[PDB]
Design a protein around this ligand. Structure first.
Ligand SMILES: NC(=O)C1=CN([C@@H]2O[C@H](COP(=O)(O)OP(=O)(O)OC[C@H]3O[C@@H](n4cnc5c(N)ncnc54)[C@H](OP(=O)(O)O)[C@@H]3O)[C@@H](O)[C@H]2O)C=CC1
Ligand SMILES: [Zn+2]
Lengths: 208, 460, 125, 86, 115, 297, 96
């Protein structure tokens, strides 16, 4: 390991593994998997029905007390049956640690809103509904937060076009800003950058 | 052969091969790779009609369509006819078939001639490469009559060469002694040799008798000559002797026919009459040239003040002799169906869009039908392909090559008429490499093929 | 607690796509062919969904390439064919599927080069 | 009123096409003996009922199913179509 | 099987009830909006547009899809009540500035390559 | 047909319509709408302007990049007209003035300038020329305005045989001088008026450019209804919630609108004329702080 | 070496010039057309051919790291002169 390689920490790796096993033991009803990254990041995969309990536990337990919600986001993977992946990032100031909770959903199944647990989630959840179309149940006010009023479609889905469907201009006939089907003077050049000759043998998949 | 068209900002950049283990292995011929230069020259972009001076001038789509529809409505019967070129798709073929049927015409012809005597194009196995390209690798002897596969089907000849090198295939030829990149046994040039093979006097009959899996291939070049039906009868007799004497090995399918143009098999499957003899016997007064650039029919052998319609993409020998010109799309510009010499149907994809006012061929014919009042049922591409499935359901299966064997029926239907063989050697048009670079309108329009011809004729 | 409804999934009304870009477009589901310029095969592992080519024209100013459809650069990646077909049906797109092409195994042998009586005898090396 | 062509769509491996298959293998040639100028197209289906299409003058077409028909049955059907009786 | 988690309704009757509620709310809002944003349309034209926007989704047979559509519709209704939207947004429903795209085969054949 | 003149795209802002239009008098009431309709479909517009560029500043957003080119010209000069119409395949004449000026009287505005434009367009190889003149334009008119209009019609017909003449009557628009003129007055019962919407005239001009057989025809663009002047002014004052230019304009507005049933109208161009009541609120909403007028047919 | 078009326009180093019937010329009227006067092809045509007595020469474009990537040019073909792929300079062995 030369100065060009990021050094490994083993103490934190073991600590995170032990705490992940601890959380798994306490909550066997919801926890489906626990992983620790090679760079000491602990992530927990749970059933969607356990968002309110597990988070509450992590917020309220004496050993955990993850009091801060750093971020709440969603990841779109169209090849999965449950399209959307809801990610909760939590920070514990008492133990100076970070955790990640991961959940799955689809276009029609809603997710319970964690506003009752973390207030910070409120706006975050709105953003998810705006950008991926994931519905959050029992939300104080769920509406668009980023897109234009009356915007049709959820732009952060992997099948939404990059340039959208409509574009805005001004019309002097009607004396107002109008929306028309999008037409680009220069179409976006699509570059095929993926190369053959795979780079990382550590991530090779079986040839089924 | 499968290809990949590489484009960039709506312009064809290059052509690359595509791996198909059963058709083109991994490669393509030089013409396929380097003839895309011809898609940018001598292009038809707008409709044209004759002006008062008798010259061709540009016009709108409505004017040209109305001018064609007036003559279509005025005439009827055998006075209306069409010829299909060598670069036409199944969609336009069935479209024009239906259009001329609605006016009660059956003069649907192709430039290449296939003998209609006996079974004709009624049995699919009567005009296909039944052994298939991937099946060439299982043969132990092979006989080639009246063909030069090196320039007539380069990938077929490459497969024969591979089987010759690896499977110790034995190759024999009847025709001119051309070079095939591998050594073969030259029986002769006269068609009479074929008869000897049927009689058993010629020792190659005995050599082929012991073959476990014999293959016989007859090229369309030998069928283009006036004695083609007699040649096909002789080759069918040879195959009959093979099956009855040496025994039926099973589903081997010895009889094979190798074609030269991509539009022939689909037209034969769609009921088109091969050859232009129907046009010659009953000259029409309005004629459709669906990309017809073979030069077979001139204005000399048509009635005076005949009406000629050319619909294609390139300006070639067939365009200036027309009265109304409709610009069509090329194979790089439309999703179109082509059936290869094996009988396998494959569809192209849209790489770029047709230039100027050019449209899709079947769309042009459908619009013409709507203007003339004989409106056709189909409106979209899927409806055209449903019509294709109605006429011939195997034109919508895009990777199947298998088919039933009807050799016995066509064989005993071929034994009725006995035309004598001519005393002319079987000389194919593709004698030398210089004759291979320019064969169709796309090739003749390219500087690359002109450079190839100039380099072949004289080299530094 | 459970509807137990029996109907095919269809989220067409919720995606915000214009009506013309649904019943007219034709997606293609395929494994991309290997680039014959290279011998690597790492780009032929996944399935791709791509839309049909529409009209591109030249800009009167600067001569750039202008387009009008939004789905020109949209290519989706899927693990298996069934996943891609399910996605296409759920989104209400007509699709064409052609099966994966795998290179058949071949009997390679160096000693076949130096053959006593067969034709695999190489002229040089 | 004038017959222009007929097309027989039969399947290769389906048992419901078997009789139709037999018809060809036994009498198709003889039918061509009676009809030297009528194009008798035979084509291949796949999981589709065998069918007979008659295309008359001016593009008028009429189809009849041949599923599970016997060889004598299809012989009679083709005779009926060729003779013009209905 | 095919058992799924509900959103608001369990079967089609409750979804239809919610659709009727939303339609009543939009119908009552139309003239107030027409007056408030100082529109150029009439109230009959606005209610016809509301009817058309409802009839566009008349082919849905999934209670989950229907009630999610209803959730969305209440969202735009709430946008319109509170005048979050400008005058331009309300019009975006009428496509007044767009050229009429013909549908017959001959017109599409003449205008361009678009199928 | 000069391939670069072939339509391309989907008829949007960045598309190509194959129309290269020179719109004389494009800084006016009708010019802005004509340029807007020409630019929203992707056509290239040459705007020849006499005034300062500041007054042409509003035309720029109407087209995409490079689709509108502004050029100086003089009506008295032929070289400027020549160089403005050198490369156009469509020329539209919208030059008009409703009053007298010490440099331009009615004869130069309505006779000499259109004659020069038509002659230069013919000598330059322009395919289509469109000319606009009043509906009530007759030689025997009392007013010099409409007499000059009629002389200009005859002269442009002589110079450009394939010229299309349009005879709109009393166009009313947001920036017009018909509804605003009456609303700024803050005599009739025998005079009849037949006003036509601005957008209808714009679409008529566009279709006439597109229409292939509208070469030498003469059109009369009129509205759906004929209005007595008194009740029309009453309705104008009622819509604005209001209680109820030297010599030529009052004479013109006292004249009745002619009826020319033999000439084709907007219906020939596939346009449904918009009634005045629908757009009266749009025009007159800005003159503030229901019972439409009765019509005669 | 800047040529003039038959219409009167200037032809760029790429050979670009609007023909008689092209409408786009209107963009240049009352304005100017931007053409670079210095043609790289003519300027590189007049360079002298360097004489070196080695079978293989090296070219980096001059300036060291301020030029182009270093390349090696073979001079065995006495028929022609070896040309740098980047710089366009020419090299040739002292025949006779
Ligand atoms: N109610 C109406 O307005 C209808 C109009 N008429 C006809 O329709 C045409 C256009 O109408 P409209 O747009 O309302 O008129 P405008 O008053 O709005 O302006 C007409 C255009 O012509 C130009 N122009 C006027 N006089 C001269 C001149 N002496 N020299 C050069 N350019 C000049 C003006 O440019 P600049 O800014 O430099 O002055 C102006 O851009 C006119 O020919 C008119 O006669 C048809 C029926 C009635
Ligand atoms: Zn150099």
């Amino acid at each position: 390991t030369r100065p060009t390689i990021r050094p490994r920490n083993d103490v934190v790796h073991k600590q995170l593994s032990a705490f992940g096993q601890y959380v798994a033991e306490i909550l066997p009803k919801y926890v489906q998997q626990v992983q620790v990254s090679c760079f000491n990041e602990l992530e927990i995969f749970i059933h969607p029905d356990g968002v309110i309990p597990v988070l509450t536990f992590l917020r309220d337990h004496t050993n955990a007390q993850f009091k801060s919600l750093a971020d709440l986001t969603a990841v779109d993977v169209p090849t999965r049956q449950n399209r959307f992946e809801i990610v909760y990032n939590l920070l514990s100031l008492r133990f100076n640690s970070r955790i990640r909770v991961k959940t799955y959903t689809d276009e029609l199944t809603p997710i319970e809103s964690s506003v009752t647990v973390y207030k910070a989630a409120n706006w975050y959840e709105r953003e998810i509904w705006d950008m991926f179309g994931v519905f959050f149940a029992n939300h104080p006010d769920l509406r668009r937060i980023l897109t234009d009023y009356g915007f049709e479609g959820h732009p952060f889905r992997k099948d939404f076009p990059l340039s959208g469907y409509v574009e805005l201009r001004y019309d002097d006939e009607v004396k107002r800003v109008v929306a028309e089907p999008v037409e680009l003077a220069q179409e976006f050049r699509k570059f095929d950058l993926n190369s053959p000759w795979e780079a990382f043998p550590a991530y090779r998949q079986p040839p089924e | 052969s499968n290809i990949v068209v590489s484009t960039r900002t709506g312009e064809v950049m290059r052509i690359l091969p595509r791996m198909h283990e059963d058709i083109n292995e991994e490669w393509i011929s030089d013409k396929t790779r380097f003839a895309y230069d011809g898609l940018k020259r001598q292009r038809l972009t707008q409709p044209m009609i004759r002006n008062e001076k008798g010259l061709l001038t540009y016009t709108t789509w409505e004017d040209a369509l109305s001018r064609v529809a007036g003559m279509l409505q005025s005439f009827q019967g055998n006075d209306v006819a069409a010829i299909a070129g060598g670069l036409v798709d199944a969609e336009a073929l069935v479209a024009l078939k239906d259009l001329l049927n609605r006016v009660d015409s059956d003069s649907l012809c192709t430039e290449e001639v296939f003998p209609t005597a006996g079974a004709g194009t009624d049995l699919r196995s009567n005009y296909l490469l039944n052994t298939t390209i991937a099946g060439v690798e299982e043969a132990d002897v092979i006989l080639l009559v009246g063909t030069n596969p090196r320039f007539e089907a380069p990938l077929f000849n490459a497969r024969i060469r591979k089987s010759w090198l690896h499977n110790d295939l034995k190759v024999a030829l009847i025709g001119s002694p051309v070079d095939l990149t591998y050594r073969y046994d030259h029986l002769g040039d006269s068609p009479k040799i074929l008869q000897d093979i049927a009689s058993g006097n010629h020792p190659f009959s005995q050599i082929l008798k012991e073959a476990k899996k014999p293959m016989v291939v007859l090229g369309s070049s030998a069928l283009q000559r006036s004695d083609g039906t007699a040649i096909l009868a002789a080759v069918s007799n040879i195959a009959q002797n093979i099956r009855l004497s040496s025994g039926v090995t099973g589903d081997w399918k010895v009889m094979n026919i190798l074609h030269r143009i991509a539009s022939q098999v689909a037209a034969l499957d769609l009921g088109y009459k091969p050859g232009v003899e129907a046009i010659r016997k009953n000259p029409p007064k309005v004629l459709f040239l669906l990309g017809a650039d073979g030069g077979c029919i001139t204005r000399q052998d048509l009635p005076k003040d005949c009406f000629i319609i050319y619909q294609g993409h390139h300006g070639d020998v067939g365009a200036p002799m027309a009265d109304v010109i409709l610009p069509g799309a090329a194979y790089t510009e439309k999703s179109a169906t082509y059936v290869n010499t094996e009988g396998r149907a494959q569809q192209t994809k849209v790489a770029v869009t047709p230039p100027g006012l050019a449209r899709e061929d079947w769309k042009i014919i459908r619009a013409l039908s709507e203007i003339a009042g004989m409106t056709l049922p189909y409106d979209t591409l899927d409806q055209v392909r449903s019509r294709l499935e109605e006429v011939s359901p195997n034109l919508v299966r895009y990777d199947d090559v298998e088919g039933a064997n009807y050799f016995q029926q066509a064989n005993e239907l071929s034994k009725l008429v006995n035309q004598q063989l001519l005393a002319d050697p079987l000389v194919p048009p593709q004698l030398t490499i210089k004759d291979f670079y320019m064969t169709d309108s796309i090739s003749r329009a390219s500087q690359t093929m002109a450079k190839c011809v100039k380099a072949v004729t004289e080299g530094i | 607690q459970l509807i137990a409804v029996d109907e095919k999934l269809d989220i067409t009304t919720l995606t915000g796509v214009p009506e013309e870009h649904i019943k007219t477009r034709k997606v293609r589901i395929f494994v991309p062919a290997r680039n014959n310029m290279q011998s690597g095969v790492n780009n032929t592992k996944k399935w791709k969904m791509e839309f049909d080519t529409r009209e591109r024209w030249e800009n009167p100013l600067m001569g750039w390439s202008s387009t009008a459809d939004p789905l020109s650069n949209l290519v989706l990646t899927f693990s298996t064919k069934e996943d891609a077909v399910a996605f296409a049906e759920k989104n209400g797109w007509s699709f064409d599927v052609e099966e994966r092409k795998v290179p058949k195994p071949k009997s390679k042998s160096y000693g076949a080069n130096f053959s006593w009586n067969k034709r695999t005898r190489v002229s040089t090396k | 009123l004038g017959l222009r062509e007929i097309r027989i769509h039969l399947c290769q491996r389906s048992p419901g096409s078997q009789g139709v298959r037999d018809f060809i293998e036994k009498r198709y040639v003889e039918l061509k003996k009676a009809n030297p100028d009528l194009p008798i197209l035979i084509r291949e289906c796949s999981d589709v009922q065998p069918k007979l299409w008659a295309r008359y003058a001016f593009g008028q077409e009429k189809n009849v199913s041949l599923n599970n028909f016997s060889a004598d049955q299809v012989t009679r059907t083709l005779e009926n179509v060729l003779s013009g009786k209905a | 099987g095919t058992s799924v988690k509900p959103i608001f309704s369990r079967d089609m009757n409750e979804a239809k009830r919610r659709v009727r509620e939303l339609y009543r709310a939009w119908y009552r809002e139309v003239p107030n909006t027409v007056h408030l944003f100082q529109l150029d349309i009439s109230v009959k034209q606005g209610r016809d547009k509301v009817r058309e926007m409802f009839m566009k989704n008349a082919h849905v047979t999934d209670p989950r899809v229907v009630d999610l559509l209803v959730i969305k519709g209440k969202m735009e209704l709430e946008e319109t009540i509170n005048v979050w939207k400008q005058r331009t947004h309300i019009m975006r429903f009428f496509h007044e500035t767009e050229a009429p795209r013909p549908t017959d085969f001959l017109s599409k054949f003449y205008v361009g390559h678009d199928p | 047909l000069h391939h670069a003149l072939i339509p391309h795209g989907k008829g949007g802002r960045s598309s190509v319509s194959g129309i290269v239009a020179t719109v004389f008098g494009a800084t006016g009431f009708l010019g802005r709408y004509v340029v807007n309709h020409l630019g929203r479909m992707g056509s290239q517009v040459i705007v020849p302007y006499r005034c300062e560029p500041y007054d042409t500043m509003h035309l720029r957003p109407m087209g995409d990049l490079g689709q509108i080119i502004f050029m100086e010209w003089n009506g008295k000069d032929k070289d400027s007209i020549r160089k403005v119409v050198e490369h156009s395949n469509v020329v539209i004449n919208l030059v008009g003035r409703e009053w007298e000026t010490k440099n331009f009287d009615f004869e130069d505005v309505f006779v000499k300038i259109p004659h020069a434009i038509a002659q230069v367009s013919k000598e330059a190889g322009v395919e289509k020329l469109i000319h606009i003149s009043h509906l009530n334009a007759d030689i025997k008119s009392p007013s010099r305005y409409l007499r000059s209009k009629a002389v200009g019609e005859k002269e442009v017909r002589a110079a450009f045989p394939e010229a299309t003449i349009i005879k709109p009557s009393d166009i009313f628009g947001r920036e017009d001088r018909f509804l605003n003129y009456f609303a700024s007055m803050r005599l009739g019962k025998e005079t009849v008026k037949q006003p036509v919407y601005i957008v209808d005239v714009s679409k008529g001009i566009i279709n006439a450019i597109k229409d292939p057989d509208a070469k030498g025809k003469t059109f009369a663009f009129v509205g759906p209804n004929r209005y007595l002047l008194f009740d029309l002014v009453q309705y104008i004052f009622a819509v604005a919630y209001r209680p109820f230019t030297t010599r030529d304009k009052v004479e013109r507005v006292h004249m009745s609108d002619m009826t020319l049933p033999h000439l084709p109208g907007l219906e020939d161009l596939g346009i449904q004329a918009t009634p005045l009541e629908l757009k009266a609120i749009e025009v007159l909403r800005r003159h503030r702080t229901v019972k439409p007028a009765k019509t005669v047919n | 070496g800047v040529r003039t078009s038959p219409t009167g326009e200037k032809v760029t180093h790429t050979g670009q010039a609007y023909d008689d019937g092209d409408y786009r010329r209107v963009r240049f009227s009352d304005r100017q057309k931007e053409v670079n006067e210095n043609f790289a092809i003519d300027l590189i045509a007049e360079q002298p051919v360097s004489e070196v007595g080695s079978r293989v020469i090296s070219c980096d474009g001059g300036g060291g790291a301020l030029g182009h990537p270093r390349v090696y040019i073979n001079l065995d073909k006495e028929t022609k002169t070896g040309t740098c792929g980047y710089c366009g300079l020419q090299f040739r062995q002292p025949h006779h």
